[PDB]
Symmetry: D2
Subunit: 254 residues, 4 copies
C-alpha cells in the first residue's frame, strides 16, 4: 500500500458538470493537480474558456451542455467515452432559489428540482453506463447540509427537498452499482465562500446568522470542499460508498 499516491488520480479521466465556476471549477483544479484528465461540462461556455486556460493540458474536452437535457447528457457521455474511458464523474451543477413556500411559483420549484435532482440523474445514468460496464468508477455528488437540515433564516424549500433527493439518489446508485465496482458518494457542504455566496452578504441579517450557526464561525473555502471531493474520488476512498460526508464547519453538529 502506497500512501504517498493513494489520493492521486493518475491515469483517470474525470467528467465534471458545473466545471466553469465555483465549486466545480475548484474540484477541477484539485483533480488536475492530482493527475486526472478532465471532461469539462457547463452551460456557460465562456466560464469554460476561463477553466480551460487555467487547467491547460489536463483538459481532454470541453462540452457545453445543460444537465436538465437528458439527451444532451447521453450525448456528452458518448462524446467523452470516444476521447477516453471516463472513470470519475462529479455532479456539481446545482442552483438555489429563495422563495417563501406560500408564494412559490410553480416554475421555481420545477427549475430547482430539474437542475438539482433530475439533471444529476441524467448525468449519472449517462456517464455511469460505461463505468458499470467496465466494473470500475467513482461518482462524487454535490449534496448539501440542506439535504440533512433546513437553512435559516432564509426559506428555499425546493432547495432542501432537492438536496434530500440528492442524498438518497447517491445512496440508491451506490447500492445498485456496488457489486459492479462503481462507488457513489456525496459531499454535504455548509456555506461555501464562492463568489456567489460571498455577495449573499450584502445582507448582514442572513450572513451573521449563518456564521453564528457554524461552530467554526466561517464559511468553507472552495478548496476545502474540493479536497474532500478529491478524497472521495480517489482510491483512498476505496471502501467508501453510499456515504454522505459533511464538510460544514460543524454546522450539522448543533
Amino acid at each position: 500500500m502506497d500512501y504517498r499516491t493513494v489520493f492521486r488520480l493518475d491515469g483517470a479521466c474525470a467528467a465534471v458538470t458545473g466545471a466553469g465556476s465555483g465549486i466545480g471549477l475548484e474540484i477541477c483544479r484539485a483533480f488536475a493537480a492530482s493527475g486526472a484528465r478532465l471532461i469539462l461540462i457547463d452551460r456557460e461556455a465562456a466560464a469554460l474558456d476561463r477553466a480551460a486556460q487555467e487547467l491547460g493540458a489536463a483538459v481532454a474536452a470541453r462540452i457545453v451542455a445543460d444537465v436538465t437535457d437528458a439527451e444532451a447528457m447521453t450525448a456528452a457521455a458518448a462524446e467523452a467515452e470516444a476521447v477516453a474511458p471516463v472513470s470519475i464523474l462529479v455532479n456539481s451543477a446545482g442552483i438555489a432559489r429563495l422563495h417563501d413556500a406560500l408564494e412559490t411559483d410553480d416554475a421555481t420549484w420545477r427549475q430547482v428540482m430539474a437542475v438539482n435532482v433530475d439533471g444529476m440523474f441524467w448525468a449519472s445514468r449517462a456517464f455511469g453506463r460505461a463505468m458499470v460496464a467496465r466494473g470500475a468508477g467513482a461518482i462524487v455528488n454535490l449534496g448539501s447540509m440542506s439535504g440533512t437540515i433546513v437553512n435559516r433564516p432564509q426559506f428555499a424549500s425546493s432547495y432542501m427537498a432537492s438536496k434530500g433527493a440528492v442524498h438518497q439518489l447517491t445512496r440508491a446508485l451506490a447500492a445498485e452499482w456496488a457489486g459492479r465496482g462503481v462507488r457513489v458518494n456525496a459531499l454535504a457542504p455548509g456555506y461555501v465562500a464562492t463568489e456567489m455566496t460571498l455577495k449573499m452578504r450584502e445582507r448582514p441579517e442572513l450572513f451573521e446568522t449563518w456564521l453564528d450557526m457554524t461552530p467554526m464561525g466561517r464559511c468553507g473555502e472552495p478548496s476545502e470542499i474540493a479536497a474532500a471531493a478529491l478524497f472521495l474520488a480517489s482510491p483512498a476512498a476505496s471502501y467508501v460508498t453510499g456515504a454522505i460526508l459533511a464538510v460544514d464547519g460543524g454546522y450539522t453538529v448543533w
Copy 2:
C-alpha cells in the same frame, strides 16, 4: 390534560390525498373513528365513490383530482375551505415503479418525482395556506424507509430519491411554518401489506429477502401505519414537528 381523549380529532376536518386506496383509505378510517370530518382526494373517481360510501357521514367532500396538477390542488383547497376549515392534511398520494438505473425511461423518473414530491408540495402549499393564516394546523406526509435507506434486492432509484425529497420537504415546511403554529411531520413506513406491495411476489426472491431484513419478520398492516398517522395528526403530537417517524418493524435498525 385528558390523556384518554388526547389522540382524538373531534371537531377537526382532515384532507387526505390518495384517499381511495391502501394507506390513505385506512388513514381515513382511523380519522373518522377519531371524530374527524374528511375531504377525500384521489385521481380515481370510482375508488373515491367506494371510499365515500363506507365512510358515510364523516365525508365533508370528495374531490377527484390529480396531485401533480398544481392548479387543481389550489382549487381543491378553495373548494374544501368553503365546505369545512381544513386543519389537518395527509399527503398519502404516492407511487412506486421498478426500474434498473441504466435502463430508466425518462418519463418513469419524471412521473415518480412528479407524484411523490411535486404533488406533495402542490397539496401542501394549497391546503397549508389557510392553516398558516389561522395559525394552526397539522400535516402528515407519507415518507418511507426508502427516504432513509435503499431497498434490496429490487431497484427503484426514483422512489428512493423521491422519498429523500419527501423527508426534507417535510422538515423545510416544519421550519418555515413552526412559528405560525403549523406542524409538519412524516411517517417512514417499512413494507406494508398493500396493492403497491403484494403485487411484488411476483419475483419470488423479493419477499423472502424483505422479511429476512425486517427484525419483526413481517410486513406492517395499513392499520399500524394509520395509528401512527393518527398520533402525528392529533394534539398528542403538539411538540412534534419536522420528525421522521420510522414505522418499519425495525428495518432501519439493522
Copy 3:
C-alpha cells in the same frame, strides 16, 4: 383494529424509573389515566411517596432504588413480577451535569454514564427478562435531542455521549428482542419545562439561545413528552421498534 381504544393500556402494568419527578411522573399520570397499573422506581423515597399519594390506586408497588445499583434493579424486577407481570418499562431516570471537557473531573463523567446508560441497561435487562419469557413487552427510553445533536451554548460532553449510547442501546435491544415480541423505542425530547431545566431557565444567556434555536420558540411541557411516550408504549405503535422519535419543537430540523 379499534382506533377508539388502540392508545389504551388497560390490563397492563408499567414500571417507570424516575417516577418521582418531571417527565417520569407525568408519564405515570398518563399511563394511569390510560388504564395501566404502575411500578414506581426512584432513588428518592420522599418523592416516590408524594407520587404514590397522587397516583392512588394505579400504584401496584413503589421501589426505592438506584438504577446504577444493578443488583437493586434485579431485585426490583423480581419484586414487581411477584406482584404483577410487568409488560411495559419506561427508563426515565437520568441526570445532566454541566462541565467543560478540559475541567471535567473523572467522577462527573462516570456518574452521568452510570445513571443514563448503565442504569438504563440494568433496568432493561432486569424487567426485560420476563417480557422476553412471555413473548410480549414494550420499552420506552428517554433519549434526547442530545443523542443526535450537541446543545449550545453550555457544555456537557458526558450528557451528549450518554444520550448517543441511549439511542443505540434502544436499537440494540430492539433488534435482539424483536423475535420475542418486545418493542424498544426512544423519545428524543428537546428542552422540557421540568425540575431538570428549572435553574438554567433563570439564566437568559442560556435560555434566550435555547428558544432562538427551537423553531416552535418554547420548551415542551412534560405532558407533551408523556403523550408521545404513551403512543410508543401502546398497541398503536405495534409496528414501531428501534425508532428514535424527536419531540423537540423542531430543534433538530435546523
Copy 4:
C-alpha cells in the same frame, strides 16, 4: 492549496492508541508514510516493539498505558508533550465482546464502555489539553457502523451503545473546541479484515451474513480505514468537524 501536499502530515506529531495491531497499527504506517512522527500507545509491548522495528525513525515515543486509567492517560499526554507537541490524536483502542442481553454480566458491560467510551474521553481530554492551548489539533475517533446501526446475527449490545456514545462524544468535543482550532471527527467502519475479524471465517454462520449485508461483498482492508483516517487527520479535512464518516462498503445504505 496546494493539493499535492494537502494530505501530508510533515512536521506533525500524532499519538495513536491501540497502535500495536490491527487498524491502529495500519494508521501508524499511513501516518509515517505521510511524514508524521508518532507516539505509539498500547497496553503491553510488543505490540509496540515489533511496531517500532517496523516504523523505524518515525517513532518519537512509545507509551504503555491503559486507556481505561484516567491517570495513565493524563500522564501519557504529559510524557508525549515532553518529547514533542502532539497535534494529532487517533483513538483506535477498542474492544468488542459478544453477549446476549439477558446473559450479560455487569463487568462485561462496564469494561466495553470503559475501553470504548471512557478511555476515548480520558485520552481526548489529556491530549486535547495542549492542542486547545496551542489553538490547533485534529482528533480522529474510531467509531463504527455499530454506532449507527445494529450488527447481525451476533449480539453485543454494549458495543452498539459504546459506539453511539463515541459518535456523540466526537460531536460534543467538535462543538466545544471548534473555536479553539481543534477538529474532532469519527470514522464509522464496516467489517475490517484485521487478524481478529479474519478469525471469524471460520464461523460462516456469521461471516457469510456479514458479506451478504455489505453491498461491496467484502470486508474492508485495514489500509482502507487508515487512508480515511489520514484524510480526516490531514489539512485536506480543514472544514470537516463533528463528522461521522461511513467507511463500510455501503453497509449502512441498505
